[PDB]
């Protein structure tokens, strides 16, 4: 095959111009979509918080519409999915991953409006869910949409445009170009066989998407942590320790979300009315907690700069972490449209800060700042649950801009991946696709 | 489909043996990378110290700077021709090939050949990088332990050879990410599925980087500081720059290939004509590293000076052309040393040059030429060797200007784009093709 290789090596990196151009329009759309989604979630959340002012006196009545408003929006999201596109429930990343292995269909005519509006209700209701779920799945579906609309033929174009959709989808969710592209080549793409996914094209999609996001969200960081301190070579060993901790907790978390999917499936047994109702309950709880204990609800981005600064108590970091574990499970495993990605950053951040605290008082000769251990742990639950640390590490580096912590971030992350593996853990996404893929045959 | 379901449930379960052994590779590659890096400086120091004791008589030190770098050069071209011809030039294509199971990994030979051989050319002050030596050595290091510990399997044979190369590029730049990204964007088998463990590659890259940090910390190779930001209405300029890189990329790619031939004529294949030729190129690199050091040496030293807009337009043009010349002579003559680094220095100067024009053409953008330098720094790496992702993440890891991430991606993309629409090719793969086609013919 030596001669084939010589022919191949010279024909390397020659992507069809049509695919490059089509990647450019996919990105532009996925961007504007993700922007519009984000803008939408904000508006609804704004009106909700605007209602708690109209009834800011009668405290019970306050605690009433705080519940109802998030309930109505949740049900409307639980409904849109259970009725028109069941594949739009949950994250949506396993489903796109499935579409890459050619085992799940990309019914963009149904998912695009369902994921967009359904998620807009759940997210806009202030449920503990991310924007990644929608944006990624929506993005990939945009990639398929232009594929059928322009009728491009080829496995390259199908796999590529599907990938640059998800990539550009993740990019606009976090203003993180590199994280999006890296997500495709480390976790998204088929993991057991060769593939014709033009990386250069995935790049062009992300670029146009991120640019679109930059047109509308200028001069405000999703997370402004500020330039923290550094990490000495004799401090590193504390990060490997934090990693191990994440490493045994990852799989445990994985079992809970999987198990909670089952436990919550009983409550409705597949019935659309029981499910929708249960949705409004979970959503309403989040809207309630959104007023009385905001750190237990919401996406989680808000409490990240705070924890990293050490402005929470050790008691709070235990409160927030426990309660958020409970609410994250409730919102995601219930099948509501919305990613688990972002809330897992919060869990990691909180747990990291918790470690950093104890680490500070135990060893003042190190001159530690508990914020360094939070940033390290930020992308650590993305290493022991999702098992895509290279994505997490780069992502966190894109959102926090503290490169001088690249070693602890890596080391901790790898502490999580190695111990997740050894303790009997499996990637959260693939472990869900397999669940979905087995069920499809089980019946 | 059921095949997939089973595969999913078993995903990311790298054998502990492949893991534990990756940790030792990176260590050995790290320590070696450090020792290599030290020796090169030590030898540069001597030539610096020798120029002192013969300070007067300008024609005398023009001679001793020649000779010292002429002698060291010959010693390098010799240790390769006589003991490991495969350990000439870069070495990355060779490891790329070895990953395809299409080239041999003679670590018992290549390791001490590349090491001391590199020391002659690197420490001679020739326009070469530490990548080639480090990456290649690293792979051979990783191969050594595969042999030494007799690990059996394609996965094991592929992983350990990869992490070694990864942990070697890293320790040559203190860039842990770009090391891991080099393997999965360029180094690994580009046309068939392979069993390389990402997780395991990581472990190797760390341990190496850790070793490097033990011996080199607190001092960065390239310091630029925090440059200004990049307005959205200014972004198009980074596309124009990338386009310029995109058309020059292949043109340079031709010359680095063509000059290989034109130098192979000079010595025909003879070890004596070659070594003696290599000592002329090397001797020139020690000489030029005194009358205009910005035309010789690795090139890392002029980058911050370039970024800060300290040069003038003329001195930029001079340095560029001069370095275009001196780079080919060092690499296309098969001297042990990568071309990765001297392209960074080429891209930086070219970028600055473009930036210099931008500042005066558009004062309303309030531009700083340094931003274009950063954008264009890893643009040759994108338009020639065609690894923009690894290139960008590298530059980011060495300049810490994430605020310029959009211009850096735009430029690097417009380079990888226009290089394809002009018939350019992955230079590292264009070399392996050459070597693989000269073999079966
Ligand atoms: Br899901
Ligand atoms: Br998600
Ligand atoms: Br070479
Ligand atoms: Br090179």
C-alpha to C-alpha distance for B23 and A341, rounded to whole angstroms:
30
How close is the Cα of B340 to the center of ligand 4, in Å? 4
C-alpha to C-alpha distance for B339 and B331, rounded to whole angstroms:
7
For B129, list phi and psi in degrees, rounded to 5.
-100, 175
Contact present, B299 and B344 (Cβ < 8 Å): yes
DSSP three-state, residue B10: coil
B90 is in an annotated binding site: yes
Name the structure determination technique.
Answer: X-ray
Strand partners, B129: B338
- CA count, 13 A, side-chain hemisphere, A196: 10
Structure tokens that stand for A327 in this block: 């609410």
Closest among A352, A338, A331, A357 to A396, alpha carbons compared: A352
Domains and CATH numbers, chain B: 1-441 (1.10.3080.10)
How close is the Cα of B336 to the center of ligand 3, in Å? 9
- CB pair distance less than 8 Å for B426 and A12: yes
Stretch 284-303 of chain A: residues touching chain B, C-beta under 8 Å: none
Stretch 234-263 of chain A: residues touching chain B, C-beta under 8 Å: 236
Closest among B5, B13, B3, B12 to A436, alpha carbons compared: B5
DSSP secondary structure code for residue B337 in this structure: S
Residue with structure tokens 């800011």?
Answer: A56
Contact present, B368 and B228 (Cβ < 8 Å): yes
- CB pair distance less than 8 Å for A215 and B199: no
DSSP three-state, residue B185: helix
Distance from CA of B423 to the nearest CA of A (A): 9
Asked if A389 has any chain B CB less than 8 Å from its own CB, the reply is yes
What resolution, expressed in A, was reported for this entry? 3.2
Chain A positions in Cβ-Cβ contact with residue B246 (cut-off 8 Å) = none
Closest among A99, A161, A95, A122 to A37, alpha carbons compared: A122
- By C-alpha distance, the chain B residue nearest A11 is B425
C-alpha to C-alpha distance for A1 and B376, rounded to whole angstroms:
38
Strand partners, B338: B129
Alpha carbon separation from A104 to A94, B4, B265 (Å, rounded): 10, 12, 58
B339 is in an annotated binding site: yes
Contact present, A48 and A126 (Cβ < 8 Å): yes
B173 is in an annotated binding site: no
Contact present, B336 and B86 (Cβ < 8 Å): no
Q: Which ligand is nearest to the CA of A261?
A: 1
Asked if B190 has any chain A CB less than 8 Å from its own CB, the reply is yes
Distance from CA of B430 to the nearest CA of A (A): 6
Q: What string of DSSP letters covers B117-154? A: HHHHHHTTT-S-BSHHHHHHHHHHHHHHHHHHTT--SH
Neighbours of B403 (CB within 10 A): 16
Closest among A345, A438, A348 to A104, alpha carbons compared: A438
Contact present, A75 and A169 (Cβ < 8 Å): no
Closest among A190, A234, A258, A248 to A381, alpha carbons compared: A248
SS3 per residue for chain A: CHHHHHHHHHCCCCCCHHHHHHHHHHHHHHHHHHHHHHHHHHHHHHHHHHHHHHCCCCHHHHHHHHHHHHHHHHHHHHHHHHHHCHHHCCCCHHHHHHHHCCCCCCCHHHHHHHHHHHHHHHHHCCCCCECHHHHHHHHHHHHHHHHHHCCCCCHHHHHHHHHHHHHHHHHHHHCCHHHHHHHHHHHHCCCCCCCCCCHHHHHHHHHHHHHHHHHHCCCCCCCCCCCCCCCCCCCCHHHHHHHHHHHHHHHHHHHHHHHHHHHHHHHHCCCHHHHHHHHHHHHHHHHHHHHHCHHHCCCCHHHHHHHHHCCCCHHHHHHHHHHHHHHHHHHHCCCCCCECHHHHHHHHHHHHHHHHHHHHHHCCCCCCCHHHHHHHHHCCHHHHCCCCHHHHHHHHHHHHCCHHHHHHHHHHHHHHHHHHHHCCCCCCCHHHHHHHHHHHHHC
- CB pair distance less than 8 Å for B429 and A393: no
Contact present, A179 and A170 (Cβ < 8 Å): yes
Burial of A190 (0-12, 13-18, 19+ CB in 10 A): middle
Q: Which ligand is nearest to the CA of A386?
A: 2
> Where is the binding site for chloride, in residues of A?
91, 340-341, 429
Asked if A410 has any chain B CB less than 8 Å from its own CB, the reply is yes
- By C-alpha distance, the chain A residue nearest B406 is A207
Chain B positions in Cβ-Cβ contact with residue A192 (cut-off 8 Å) = 4, 7, 11, 193
Alpha carbon separation from B274 to B29, B64, B191, B277 (Å, rounded): 30, 21, 36, 5
- CB pair distance less than 8 Å for B191 and A8: yes
Rg for chain A (alpha carbons), in Å? Answer: 22
Q: Which helix (H) or strand (E) holds B376?
A: helix B369-377
- CB pair distance less than 8 Å for B426 and A8: no
- CB pair distance less than 8 Å for B12 and A433: no
Asked if A417 has any chain B CB less than 8 Å from its own CB, the reply is yes
Stretch 14-43 of chain B: residues touching chain A, C-beta under 8 Å: 14, 16, 19
C-alpha to C-alpha distance for B283 and B277, rounded to whole angstroms:
10
Contact present, A2 and B102 (Cβ < 8 Å): yes
């Amino acid at each position: 095959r030596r001669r084939q290789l010589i022919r191949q090596l010279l024909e390397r990196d020659k992507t069809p111009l049509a695919i490059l151009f089509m990647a450019a329009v996919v990105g532009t759309l996925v961007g504007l979509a993700a922007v519009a989604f984000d803008k939408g979630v904000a508006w609804l959340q704004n009106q909700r918080m605007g209602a708690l002012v109209h009834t800011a006196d009668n405290y019970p009545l306050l605690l009433t519409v705080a519940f109802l408003c998030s309930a109505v929006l949740a049900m409307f999201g639980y409904f849109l999915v259970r009725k028109y596109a069941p594949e739009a429930g949950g994250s949506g990343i396993p489903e796109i991953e499935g579409a890459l292995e050619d085992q799940r269909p990309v019914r963009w005519w149904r998912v695009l409006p369902v994921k967009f509006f359904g998620g807009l209700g759940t997210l806009g209701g202030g449920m503990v869910l991310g924007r990644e779920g929608p944006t990624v799945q929506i993005g990939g579906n945009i990639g398929r949409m232009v594929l059928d609309i322009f009728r491009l033929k080829g496995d390259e174009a199908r796999h590529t445009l599907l990938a640059t959709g998800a990539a550009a989808g993740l990019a606009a969710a976090f203003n993180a170009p590199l994280a999006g592209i890296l997500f495709i080549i480390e976790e998204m793409r088929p993991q057991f066989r060769y593939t014709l996914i033009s990386i250069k094209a995935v790049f062009i999609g992300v670029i146009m998407s991120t640019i679109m996001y930059r047109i509308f969200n200028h001069e405000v960081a999703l997370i402004d942590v500020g330039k923290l301190s550094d990490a000495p070579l004799n401090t590193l060993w504390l990060y490997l320790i934090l990693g191990i901790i994440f490493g045994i907790f990852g799989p445990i978390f994985n079992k809970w979300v999987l198990g909670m999917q089952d436990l919550l499936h009983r409550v409705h047994g597949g019935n659309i009315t029981k499910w929708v109702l249960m949705g409004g309950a979970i959503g309403g709880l989040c809207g309630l907690l959104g007023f009385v204990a905001p750190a237990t609800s919401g996406g989680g981005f808000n409490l990240i700069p705070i924890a990293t600064a050490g402005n929470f108590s050790m008691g709070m970091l235990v409160f927030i972490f426990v309660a958020r574990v409970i609410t994250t499970l409730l919102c995601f495993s219930s099948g509501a449209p919305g990613g688990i990605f972002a809330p897992m950053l919060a869990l990691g951040t909180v747990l990291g800060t918790a470690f950093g605290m104890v680490a500070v008082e135990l060893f003042p000769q190190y001159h530690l700042e508990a914020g360094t251990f939070a940033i390290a742990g930020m992308g650590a639950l993305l290493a022991a649950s999702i098992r895509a640390p290279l994505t997490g590490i780069i992502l966190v580096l894109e959102m926090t801009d503290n490169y001088q912590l690249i070693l602890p971030m890596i080391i901790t992350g790898l502490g999580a991946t190695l111990l997740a593996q050894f303790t009997g853990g499996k990637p959260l996404y693939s472990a869900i696709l397999a669940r979905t893929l087995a069920k499809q045959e089980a019946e």
